Amino acid sequence: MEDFVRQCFNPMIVELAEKAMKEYGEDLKIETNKFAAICTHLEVCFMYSDFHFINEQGESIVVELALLKHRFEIIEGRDRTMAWTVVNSICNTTGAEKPKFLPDLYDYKENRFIEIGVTRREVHIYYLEKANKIKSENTHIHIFSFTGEEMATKADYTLDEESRARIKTRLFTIRQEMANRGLWDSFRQSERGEETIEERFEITGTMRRLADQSLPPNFSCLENFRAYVDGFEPNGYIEGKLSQMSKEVNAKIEPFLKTTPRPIRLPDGPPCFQRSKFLLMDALKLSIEDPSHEGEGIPLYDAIKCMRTFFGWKEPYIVKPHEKGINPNYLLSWKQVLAELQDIENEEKIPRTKNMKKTSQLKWALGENMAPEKVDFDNCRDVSDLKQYDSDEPELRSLSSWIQNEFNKACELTDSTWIELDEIGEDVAPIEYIASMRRNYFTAEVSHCRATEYIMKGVYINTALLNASCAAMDDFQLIPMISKCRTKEGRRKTNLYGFIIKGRSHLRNDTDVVNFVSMEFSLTDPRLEPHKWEKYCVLEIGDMLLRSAIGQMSRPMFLYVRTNGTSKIKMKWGMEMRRCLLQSLQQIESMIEAESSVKEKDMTKEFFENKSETWPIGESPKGVEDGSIGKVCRTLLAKSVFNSLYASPQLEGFSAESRKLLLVVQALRDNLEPGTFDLEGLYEAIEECLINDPWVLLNASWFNSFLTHALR
Amino acid sequence: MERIKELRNLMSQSRTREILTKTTVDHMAIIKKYTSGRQEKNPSLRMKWMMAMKYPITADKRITEMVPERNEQGQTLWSKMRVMVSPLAVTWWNRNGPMTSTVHYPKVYKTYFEKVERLKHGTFGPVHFRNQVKIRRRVDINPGHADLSAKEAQDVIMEVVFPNEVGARILTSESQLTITKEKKEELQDCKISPLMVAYMLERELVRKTRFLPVAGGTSSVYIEVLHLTQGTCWEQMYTPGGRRGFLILGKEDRRYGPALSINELSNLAKGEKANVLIGQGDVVLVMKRKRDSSILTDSQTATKRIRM
């Protein structure tokens, strides 16, 4: 590089190399290796003939700090003309003959010319070109190297060891600190004999033929195309092309008025059904009633102790058939679960985990006999009744009124805590105080919500199921559903929800599926909404005593049984649900900051402790209702939880298109004269992202209800 | 003994043999990057699984005669099949164990120890809520050392940490930077780690700059607190508060005896010449200087030889 040469050599050498390049007719930017070669050659030549003098008696001595012969005269510091003149003068006054080319220096002590060479390859090969280039004449040749080598004619180095050592060390140091910065390879691979070449690159072959037909249709050779491109001047091409284009190519704007938008069309058909992993609104718990503070045991024993606290089991019987399968298998599975839970005592050693006996009904439930067999296509080419795959158009379903009820119930408050966060250091800066009060208010408002209970349930269940699947691979293990909380007065409590029986898990990748069957307790009669439960089998198993008010009243107890299998990736997806709180806090803080940016002061006080402010987040036949800040915080948390629990691409598409439409509507409401180019296609996108998911249908209904009020 | 024996059988297989024979030292770093590209199999879950089992940590032999097998409670600390140990052994060492002086720690981690002194000797002002525009320029995150450039900082680091593996430059000049003397005197018997000391010395001695969108202070002390000073729509005001001349003649000669190490050139003689190993494998013949050979105005005096 240029900067390296600038900072390495002294300027006195530098101006001469530039003059030499100008005389030659080269450039310093295009080629740089030749610059370094000339600088090194000039430096070596100047160093080779310095601090040398010869006394009148004929002996040569080295001195530092009167009029004595210099014993050397420089020729390389001069251009061709005066170099030839001085060479002619000296050979005439000494009787010498003109050798051929320009020698480097002349020594009076031996009365003979000297040539100096520096090479990047090794000396032995480089010697021969100089030897056979100049022959049958008296001219010494000395060759150095960048790695300590040296060689001269007749092995008579007419110099002391010290100067040669200095030259060799200078060359070694320049090479050593050149190779460190990353410039030695190109410099070394740049000497093609006695010239310097920057680089080389040619097409020369199959690449040329391939490049030949990679051109516009009116060309045949790459060179002709390059020549045409090089001599290009723009006269009128763009305007001329534009003048002869048809007028149907246009982008016309149609105004967006208050009467323009129309409600979105929803699909029609049979009602939808629940498809969540665990039921949410219709669950109860069997509390363990404050275990000891030192109690930390296996979940199986906790489940057993929770079970022993209930009396009232009866003969179970089916109340709602699954209409696809065998219900006696479900009855036998439940009875086997009860029997194998009770039969623990017939063991000399108490086990840690329970492995279920492989029974016919369990095998049918887990689908261990419905595995298709795989053979090569060659033998089964002649078989009949062969289809591609399950490439069937999805069914269309309408919207029911139970998802709204679930969302309504998910935003209420409970009597437990469900979450306890740890502590941090004390605050000093005022911004730390502001952040602390913000997060303290947010934590206080949403601590006792039901969505936290759902998050904890999902995390515990997914972690336990993943651990069981990774531990045992060829056993039918029993996995309980267990959660923990703190009571109002401050007693830890453990709750049991149901049971899960896992099949066979041999997972090699992250897409393989593992099957299981789930049984859950409930008090909700399925005969009120038969359409909601379509993939469930419901049993009546016992009676429950309620202590509400005076006296004791009995209600039936039901069991919901379902067969499923999720994934290996979705277990990891379910283990991270604590991020919804973070997202809700981010949204609240973003709104606070956005409002505070305009009214340039701190708005954390006008949001929380103010009690005269209300936000419209409700609806009724009367109209639009209002609520407090805690209510909207819980609503956002519930929305995040339900978004986590009902993931689908339809949600992504609907969210994007609805975001665009909402932005257009908001632009309309600000008196900014909006406009569109194609309002329909956005709509047909919105309906084509509206196939089956009840959550997306509820979101579309919410958008329609927002639209009917936003412009009225 | 072990290393030479491991090198011997590596020559038996040819496929590795031309790898060793045809590869220069300068290309070693080219070879070192052909390792692998796939390891991240959910590291958090793997760590959680490994922390559940007993004896998940590896240690050396001598821990067998420094830590008892069982504690007062009666729990095993290490087991026999490097040996396998549990974190209980680490906690026991932190509770009961030998004590050593820690006087060298403030001299090595001083760049970290200045930050706390700057922070806890500071004061705060009010916070302003408004809108602001942030511009960009070159910001210095490491101030470095004055009167020291990037070229000789590496030289100082090599001289202090690896005195026996320097070659060519630093070995032929006749000088000594002052800071090297104090750095060698202070760390006379420091036994923490060569690599850690080298990294910390480079961190506190070498400067480097970057680009940041800062709308406040420009000096280096205002950069490390950028997360506390600026915000989306707020501004917080804050103040910090507070080796002789040698020349090489050629490669190794077989008539001048076995080569010697860098640290054994102290004896030398009054002009003897001998072989020496320098750099990462170079072997050269050296002999000291009978003169000055400096860089004074004499180099410019060559101008008298031209333009008469």
CSV table of N, CA and C in Angstrom, one decimal, chain A residues 199-329:
chain,number,residue,atom,x,y,z
A,199,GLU,N,-1.6,-8.0,-11.4
A,199,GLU,CA,-2.4,-9.2,-11.3
A,199,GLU,C,-2.7,-9.7,-12.6
A,200,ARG,N,-3.3,-10.9,-12.7
A,200,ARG,CA,-3.6,-11.6,-13.9
A,200,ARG,C,-4.9,-12.3,-13.8
A,201,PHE,N,-5.8,-12.2,-14.8
A,201,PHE,CA,-7.1,-12.9,-14.7
A,201,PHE,C,-7.7,-13.0,-16.1
A,202,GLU,N,-8.0,-14.2,-16.6
A,202,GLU,CA,-8.5,-14.3,-18.0
A,202,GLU,C,-9.7,-15.3,-17.9
A,203,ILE,N,-10.5,-15.2,-19.0
A,203,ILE,CA,-11.7,-16.1,-19.1
A,203,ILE,C,-11.3,-17.3,-19.8
A,204,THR,N,-10.9,-17.2,-21.0
A,204,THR,CA,-10.1,-18.2,-21.8
A,204,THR,C,-10.6,-19.7,-21.6
A,205,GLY,N,-11.9,-19.9,-22.1
A,205,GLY,CA,-12.4,-21.2,-22.2
A,205,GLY,C,-13.9,-21.4,-22.1
A,206,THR,N,-14.3,-22.3,-21.3
A,206,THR,CA,-15.8,-22.6,-21.2
A,206,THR,C,-16.5,-21.4,-20.6
A,207,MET,N,-15.9,-20.7,-19.7
A,207,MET,CA,-16.5,-19.4,-19.2
A,207,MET,C,-16.8,-18.4,-20.3
A,208,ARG,N,-15.9,-18.3,-21.3
A,208,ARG,CA,-16.2,-17.4,-22.4
A,208,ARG,C,-17.4,-17.9,-23.2
A,209,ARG,N,-17.6,-19.2,-23.5
A,209,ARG,CA,-18.7,-19.6,-24.2
A,209,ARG,C,-20.0,-19.4,-23.4
A,210,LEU,N,-19.9,-19.7,-22.1
A,210,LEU,CA,-21.1,-19.4,-21.2
A,210,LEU,C,-21.5,-17.9,-21.2
A,211,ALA,N,-20.5,-17.1,-21.2
A,211,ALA,CA,-20.7,-15.6,-21.2
A,211,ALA,C,-21.3,-15.2,-22.5
A,212,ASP,N,-21.0,-15.9,-23.6
A,212,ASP,CA,-21.5,-15.5,-24.9
A,212,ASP,C,-23.0,-15.3,-25.0
A,213,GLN,N,-23.8,-16.3,-24.4
A,213,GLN,CA,-25.2,-16.2,-24.5
A,213,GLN,C,-25.8,-15.6,-23.2
A,214,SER,N,-25.1,-14.8,-22.5
A,214,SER,CA,-25.6,-14.1,-21.3
A,214,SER,C,-25.7,-12.6,-21.6
A,215,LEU,N,-26.2,-12.2,-22.8
A,215,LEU,CA,-26.2,-10.9,-23.3
A,215,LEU,C,-27.6,-10.6,-23.9
A,216,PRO,N,-28.0,-9.3,-24.1
A,216,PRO,CA,-29.2,-9.0,-24.8
A,216,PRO,C,-29.3,-9.7,-26.1
A,217,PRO,N,-30.5,-9.9,-26.7
A,217,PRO,CA,-30.6,-10.7,-27.9
A,217,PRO,C,-29.9,-10.1,-29.1
A,218,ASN,N,-29.6,-8.8,-29.1
A,218,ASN,CA,-28.9,-8.2,-30.3
A,218,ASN,C,-27.4,-8.1,-30.2
A,219,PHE,N,-26.8,-9.1,-29.6
A,219,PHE,CA,-25.4,-9.2,-29.4
A,219,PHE,C,-24.9,-10.6,-29.5
A,220,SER,N,-23.6,-10.8,-29.9
A,220,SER,CA,-23.1,-12.2,-30.1
A,220,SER,C,-21.8,-12.4,-29.3
A,221,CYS,N,-21.1,-11.3,-29.1
A,221,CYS,CA,-19.8,-11.4,-28.4
A,221,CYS,C,-19.7,-10.4,-27.2
A,222,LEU,N,-19.0,-10.8,-26.2
A,222,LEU,CA,-18.9,-9.9,-25.0
A,222,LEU,C,-18.1,-8.6,-25.3
A,223,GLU,N,-17.1,-8.7,-26.2
A,223,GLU,CA,-16.2,-7.6,-26.5
A,223,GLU,C,-17.0,-6.5,-27.2
A,224,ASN,N,-17.9,-6.9,-28.1
A,224,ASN,CA,-18.8,-5.9,-28.8
A,224,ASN,C,-19.7,-5.2,-27.8
A,225,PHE,N,-20.3,-6.0,-26.9
A,225,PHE,CA,-21.2,-5.4,-25.9
A,225,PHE,C,-20.4,-4.4,-25.0
A,226,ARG,N,-19.2,-4.8,-24.6
A,226,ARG,CA,-18.4,-3.9,-23.8
A,226,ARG,C,-18.1,-2.6,-24.6
A,227,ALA,N,-17.7,-2.7,-25.8
A,227,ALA,CA,-17.4,-1.6,-26.6
A,227,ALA,C,-18.6,-0.7,-26.8
A,228,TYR,N,-19.8,-1.3,-27.0
A,228,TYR,CA,-21.0,-0.5,-27.1
A,228,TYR,C,-21.3,0.2,-25.8
A,229,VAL,N,-21.1,-0.4,-24.7
A,229,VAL,CA,-21.4,0.2,-23.4
A,229,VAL,C,-20.5,1.3,-23.1
A,230,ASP,N,-19.2,1.2,-23.5
A,230,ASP,CA,-18.2,2.2,-23.2
A,230,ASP,C,-18.5,3.5,-23.9
A,231,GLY,N,-19.0,3.4,-25.2
A,231,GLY,CA,-19.3,4.6,-25.9
A,231,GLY,C,-20.7,5.1,-25.9
A,232,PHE,N,-21.4,5.0,-24.7
A,232,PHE,CA,-22.8,5.3,-24.6
A,232,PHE,C,-23.0,6.8,-24.1
A,233,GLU,N,-23.9,7.5,-24.7
A,233,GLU,CA,-24.3,8.8,-24.3
A,233,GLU,C,-25.8,8.9,-24.4
A,234,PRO,N,-26.5,9.4,-23.3
A,234,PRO,CA,-27.9,9.4,-23.2
A,234,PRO,C,-28.5,10.6,-24.0
A,235,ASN,N,-29.2,10.3,-25.1
A,235,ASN,CA,-29.8,11.4,-25.8
A,235,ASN,C,-31.3,11.7,-25.5
A,236,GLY,N,-32.1,10.8,-25.8
A,236,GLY,CA,-33.6,10.9,-25.5
A,236,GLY,C,-34.3,9.7,-25.2
A,237,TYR,N,-33.6,8.6,-24.7
A,237,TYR,CA,-34.2,7.3,-24.7
A,237,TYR,C,-35.4,7.2,-23.8
A,238,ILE,N,-35.4,7.7,-22.6
A,238,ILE,CA,-36.4,7.5,-21.6
A,238,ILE,C,-37.7,8.2,-22.1
A,239,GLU,N,-37.6,9.4,-22.5
A,239,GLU,CA,-38.8,10.2,-23.0
A,239,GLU,C,-39.4,9.6,-24.2
A,240,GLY,N,-38.5,9.1,-25.2
A,240,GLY,CA,-39.0,8.5,-26.4
A,240,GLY,C,-39.7,7.2,-26.1
A,241,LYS,N,-39.2,6.4,-25.2
A,241,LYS,CA,-39.9,5.2,-24.8
A,241,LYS,C,-41.2,5.5,-24.1
A,242,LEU,N,-41.2,6.5,-23.2
A,242,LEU,CA,-42.5,6.8,-22.5
A,242,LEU,C,-43.5,7.4,-23.4
A,243,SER,N,-43.1,8.1,-24.5
A,243,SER,CA,-44.1,8.7,-25.4
A,243,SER,C,-44.9,7.7,-26.1
A,244,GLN,N,-44.4,6.5,-26.3
A,244,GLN,CA,-45.1,5.5,-27.1
A,244,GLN,C,-45.6,4.3,-26.2
A,245,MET,N,-46.1,4.6,-25.0
A,245,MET,CA,-46.7,3.6,-24.2
A,245,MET,C,-48.2,3.9,-24.0
A,246,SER,N,-49.0,2.8,-24.0
A,246,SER,CA,-50.5,3.0,-23.9
A,246,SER,C,-50.9,3.6,-22.6
A,247,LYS,N,-52.0,4.3,-22.7
A,247,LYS,CA,-52.5,5.1,-21.5
A,247,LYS,C,-53.2,4.3,-20.5
A,248,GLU,N,-53.6,3.0,-20.8
A,248,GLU,CA,-54.2,2.2,-19.8
A,248,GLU,C,-53.3,1.8,-18.6
A,249,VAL,N,-52.0,2.0,-18.8
A,249,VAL,CA,-51.0,1.8,-17.7
A,249,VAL,C,-51.0,3.1,-16.9
A,250,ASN,N,-51.6,3.1,-15.7
A,250,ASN,CA,-51.8,4.3,-14.9
A,250,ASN,C,-52.0,3.8,-13.4
A,251,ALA,N,-51.9,4.8,-12.5
A,251,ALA,CA,-52.2,4.6,-11.1
A,251,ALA,C,-53.1,5.8,-10.7
A,252,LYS,N,-54.4,5.5,-10.8
A,252,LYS,CA,-55.4,6.6,-10.5
A,252,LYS,C,-55.8,6.4,-9.0
A,253,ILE,N,-56.0,7.6,-8.3
A,253,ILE,CA,-56.4,7.6,-6.9
A,253,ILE,C,-57.9,7.8,-6.8
A,254,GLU,N,-58.5,7.0,-6.0
A,254,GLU,CA,-59.9,7.1,-5.6
A,254,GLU,C,-60.0,7.6,-4.2
A,255,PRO,N,-60.8,8.6,-3.9
A,255,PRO,CA,-60.9,9.2,-2.6
A,255,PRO,C,-61.5,8.2,-1.6
A,256,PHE,N,-61.0,8.3,-0.3
A,256,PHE,CA,-61.5,7.5,0.8
A,256,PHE,C,-62.4,8.4,1.7
A,257,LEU,N,-63.7,8.2,1.7
A,257,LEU,CA,-64.6,9.0,2.4
A,257,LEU,C,-65.1,8.2,3.6
A,258,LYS,N,-66.1,8.9,4.3
A,258,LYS,CA,-66.6,8.2,5.5
A,258,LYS,C,-67.7,7.2,5.2
A,259,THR,N,-68.2,7.1,4.0
A,259,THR,CA,-69.1,6.1,3.6
A,259,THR,C,-68.5,5.0,2.7
A,260,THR,N,-67.2,5.0,2.6
A,260,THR,CA,-66.5,4.1,1.7
A,260,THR,C,-66.4,2.7,2.3
A,261,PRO,N,-65.9,2.5,3.6
A,261,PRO,CA,-65.6,1.2,4.1
A,261,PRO,C,-66.9,0.4,4.3
A,262,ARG,N,-66.8,-0.9,4.2
A,262,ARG,CA,-67.9,-1.9,4.4
A,262,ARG,C,-67.5,-3.0,5.3
A,263,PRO,N,-68.4,-3.6,6.0
A,263,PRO,CA,-68.1,-4.6,7.0
A,263,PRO,C,-67.5,-5.8,6.3
A,264,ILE,N,-66.7,-6.6,7.0
A,264,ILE,CA,-66.0,-7.8,6.5
A,264,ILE,C,-67.0,-8.9,6.6
A,265,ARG,N,-66.9,-9.8,5.6
A,265,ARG,CA,-67.8,-10.9,5.5
A,265,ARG,C,-67.1,-12.1,6.2
A,266,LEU,N,-67.9,-12.8,7.1
A,266,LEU,CA,-67.5,-13.9,7.8
A,266,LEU,C,-68.0,-15.2,7.2
A,267,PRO,N,-67.3,-16.3,7.3
A,267,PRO,CA,-67.8,-17.6,6.7
A,267,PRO,C,-69.0,-18.2,7.5
A,268,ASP,N,-69.7,-19.1,6.8
A,268,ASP,CA,-70.9,-19.7,7.4
A,268,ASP,C,-70.8,-21.2,7.4
A,269,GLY,N,-71.3,-21.9,8.3
A,269,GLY,CA,-71.3,-23.3,8.4
A,269,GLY,C,-71.6,-23.8,9.8
A,270,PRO,N,-71.1,-25.1,10.1
A,270,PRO,CA,-71.3,-25.6,11.4
A,270,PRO,C,-70.5,-24.9,12.5
A,271,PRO,N,-70.9,-24.9,13.7
A,271,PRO,CA,-70.1,-24.1,14.7
A,271,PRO,C,-68.8,-24.8,15.0
A,272,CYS,N,-67.9,-23.9,15.5
A,272,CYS,CA,-66.5,-24.4,15.9
A,272,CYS,C,-66.5,-25.1,17.2
A,273,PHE,N,-65.3,-25.6,17.5
A,273,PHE,CA,-65.1,-26.4,18.7
A,273,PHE,C,-63.8,-26.1,19.4
A,274,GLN,N,-63.7,-26.4,20.7
A,274,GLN,CA,-62.5,-26.2,21.5
A,274,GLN,C,-61.4,-27.1,21.0
A,275,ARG,N,-60.2,-26.6,20.9
A,275,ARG,CA,-59.0,-27.4,20.5
A,275,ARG,C,-57.8,-27.1,21.3
A,276,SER,N,-58.0,-26.6,22.5
A,276,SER,CA,-56.8,-26.3,23.4
A,276,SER,C,-56.3,-27.5,24.0
A,277,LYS,N,-55.1,-27.4,24.5
A,277,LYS,CA,-54.5,-28.6,25.2
A,277,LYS,C,-55.1,-28.9,26.5
A,278,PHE,N,-55.4,-27.9,27.3
A,278,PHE,CA,-56.1,-28.1,28.6
A,278,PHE,C,-57.2,-27.1,28.7
A,279,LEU,N,-58.4,-27.6,29.1
A,279,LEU,CA,-59.5,-26.7,29.3
A,279,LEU,C,-59.3,-25.7,30.4
A,280,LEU,N,-59.8,-24.5,30.2
A,280,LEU,CA,-59.5,-23.3,31.0
A,280,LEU,C,-60.6,-22.9,31.9
A,281,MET,N,-61.8,-22.7,31.4
A,281,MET,CA,-62.9,-22.1,32.3
A,281,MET,C,-63.6,-23.1,33.1
A,282,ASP,N,-63.5,-24.4,32.8
A,282,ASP,CA,-64.3,-25.4,33.4
A,282,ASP,C,-63.4,-26.4,34.2
A,283,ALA,N,-62.5,-25.9,35.0
A,283,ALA,CA,-61.6,-26.7,35.7
A,283,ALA,C,-61.7,-26.4,37.2
A,284,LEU,N,-61.5,-27.4,38.0
A,284,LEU,CA,-61.4,-27.3,39.5
A,284,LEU,C,-60.1,-27.8,39.9
A,285,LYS,N,-59.8,-27.7,41.2
A,285,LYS,CA,-58.6,-28.2,41.8
A,285,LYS,C,-58.9,-29.0,43.1
A,286,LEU,N,-57.9,-29.9,43.4
A,286,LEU,CA,-58.0,-30.7,44.7
A,286,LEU,C,-56.8,-30.2,45.5
A,287,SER,N,-57.0,-29.3,46.4
A,287,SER,CA,-56.0,-28.6,47.2
A,287,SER,C,-55.4,-29.6,48.2
A,288,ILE,N,-54.1,-29.5,48.5
A,288,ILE,CA,-53.4,-30.3,49.5
A,288,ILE,C,-53.5,-29.6,50.9
A,289,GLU,N,-54.0,-28.4,51.0
A,289,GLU,CA,-54.2,-27.7,52.3
A,289,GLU,C,-52.9,-27.5,53.1
A,290,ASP,N,-52.0,-26.7,52.5
A,290,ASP,CA,-50.9,-26.2,53.2
A,290,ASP,C,-49.9,-27.2,53.7
A,291,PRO,N,-49.1,-27.9,52.8
A,291,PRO,CA,-48.1,-28.8,53.2
A,291,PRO,C,-47.1,-28.2,54.1
A,292,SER,N,-46.2,-29.0,54.7
A,292,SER,CA,-45.2,-28.5,55.6
A,292,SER,C,-44.2,-27.7,54.9
A,293,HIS,N,-43.6,-26.7,55.6
A,293,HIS,CA,-42.6,-25.8,55.0
A,293,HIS,C,-41.3,-26.5,54.5
A,294,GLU,N,-41.0,-27.7,55.1
A,294,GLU,CA,-39.9,-28.5,54.8
A,294,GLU,C,-40.2,-29.6,53.8
A,295,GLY,N,-41.4,-29.6,53.3
A,295,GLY,CA,-41.8,-30.7,52.3
A,295,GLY,C,-41.5,-30.4,50.9
A,296,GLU,N,-40.6,-31.2,50.3
A,296,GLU,CA,-40.2,-31.2,48.9
A,296,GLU,C,-40.0,-32.6,48.4
A,297,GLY,N,-41.0,-33.1,47.7
A,297,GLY,CA,-41.1,-34.5,47.3
A,297,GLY,C,-41.4,-34.6,45.8
A,298,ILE,N,-41.6,-35.9,45.5
A,298,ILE,CA,-41.9,-36.3,44.1
A,298,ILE,C,-43.3,-35.9,43.8
A,299,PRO,N,-43.7,-35.4,42.6
A,299,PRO,CA,-45.1,-35.1,42.3
A,299,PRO,C,-46.1,-36.2,42.4
A,300,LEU,N,-45.6,-37.5,42.2
A,300,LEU,CA,-46.5,-38.6,42.4
A,300,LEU,C,-47.1,-38.7,43.8
A,301,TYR,N,-46.3,-38.5,44.8
A,301,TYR,CA,-46.8,-38.6,46.2
A,301,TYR,C,-47.7,-37.4,46.5
A,302,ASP,N,-47.4,-36.2,46.0
A,302,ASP,CA,-48.2,-35.1,46.1
A,302,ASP,C,-49.6,-35.4,45.5
A,303,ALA,N,-49.6,-36.0,44.3
A,303,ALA,CA,-50.9,-36.3,43.7
A,303,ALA,C,-51.7,-37.3,44.5
A,304,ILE,N,-51.0,-38.3,45.0
A,304,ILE,CA,-51.6,-39.3,45.9
A,304,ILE,C,-52.2,-38.7,47.1
A,305,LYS,N,-51.5,-37.8,47.8
A,305,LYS,CA,-52.0,-37.2,49.0
A,305,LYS,C,-53.2,-36.3,48.6
A,306,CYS,N,-53.1,-35.6,47.5
A,306,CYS,CA,-54.3,-34.8,47.0
A,306,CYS,C,-55.5,-35.7,46.8
A,307,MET,N,-55.3,-36.9,46.2
A,307,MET,CA,-56.4,-37.8,45.9
A,307,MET,C,-57.0,-38.4,47.2
A,308,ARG,N,-56.2,-38.7,48.2
A,308,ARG,CA,-56.7,-39.3,49.4
A,308,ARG,C,-57.7,-38.4,50.2
A,309,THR,N,-57.7,-37.1,49.8
A,309,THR,CA,-58.5,-36.2,50.6
A,309,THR,C,-60.0,-36.1,50.1
A,310,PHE,N,-60.4,-36.9,49.1
A,310,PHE,CA,-61.7,-36.8,48.5
A,310,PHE,C,-62.4,-38.1,48.7
A,311,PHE,N,-63.7,-38.0,49.2
A,311,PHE,CA,-64.6,-39.1,49.4
A,311,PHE,C,-65.8,-38.8,48.6
A,312,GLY,N,-66.4,-39.8,47.9
A,312,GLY,CA,-67.6,-39.6,47.1
A,312,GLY,C,-67.5,-40.2,45.7
A,313,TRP,N,-66.5,-41.0,45.5
A,313,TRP,CA,-66.5,-41.8,44.2
A,313,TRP,C,-67.7,-42.7,44.1
A,314,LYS,N,-68.2,-42.8,42.9
A,314,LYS,CA,-69.3,-43.7,42.5
A,314,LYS,C,-69.0,-44.5,41.3
A,315,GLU,N,-70.0,-45.2,40.8
A,315,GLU,CA,-69.8,-46.0,39.5
A,315,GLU,C,-69.8,-45.0,38.4
A,316,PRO,N,-68.7,-44.8,37.6
A,316,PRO,CA,-68.7,-43.9,36.5
A,316,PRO,C,-69.5,-44.4,35.3
A,317,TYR,N,-70.1,-43.5,34.6
A,317,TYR,CA,-70.9,-43.9,33.4
A,317,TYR,C,-70.8,-42.7,32.4
A,318,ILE,N,-71.0,-43.1,31.1
A,318,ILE,CA,-70.8,-42.2,30.0
A,318,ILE,C,-72.0,-41.3,30.0
A,319,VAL,N,-71.8,-40.0,29.7
A,319,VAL,CA,-72.9,-39.0,29.6
A,319,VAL,C,-72.8,-38.3,28.2
A,320,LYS,N,-71.8,-38.4,27.5
A,320,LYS,CA,-71.7,-37.8,26.1
A,320,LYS,C,-70.7,-38.6,25.3
A,321,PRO,N,-71.2,-39.4,24.3
A,321,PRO,CA,-70.4,-40.2,23.4
A,321,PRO,C,-69.5,-39.3,22.5
A,322,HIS,N,-68.3,-39.9,22.1
A,322,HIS,CA,-67.4,-39.3,21.2
A,322,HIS,C,-67.8,-39.4,19.8
A,323,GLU,N,-68.7,-40.3,19.5
A,323,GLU,CA,-69.3,-40.5,18.1
A,323,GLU,C,-68.3,-40.9,17.1
A,324,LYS,N,-67.0,-41.1,17.5
A,324,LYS,CA,-65.9,-41.6,16.7
A,324,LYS,C,-65.0,-42.3,17.6
A,325,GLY,N,-65.2,-43.6,17.8
A,325,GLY,CA,-64.3,-44.4,18.7
A,325,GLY,C,-65.1,-45.3,19.6
A,326,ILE,N,-64.5,-45.9,20.6
A,326,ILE,CA,-65.1,-46.8,21.5
A,326,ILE,C,-64.9,-46.2,22.9
A,327,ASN,N,-66.1,-46.0,23.6
A,327,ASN,CA,-66.2,-45.4,24.9
A,327,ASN,C,-65.9,-46.4,26.0
A,328,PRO,N,-66.3,-47.7,25.9
A,328,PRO,CA,-65.8,-48.7,26.9
A,328,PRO,C,-64.3,-48.7,27.1
A,329,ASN,N,-63.5,-48.4,26.0
A,329,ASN,CA,-62.1,-48.3,26.2
A,329,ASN,C,-61.7,-47.1,27.2
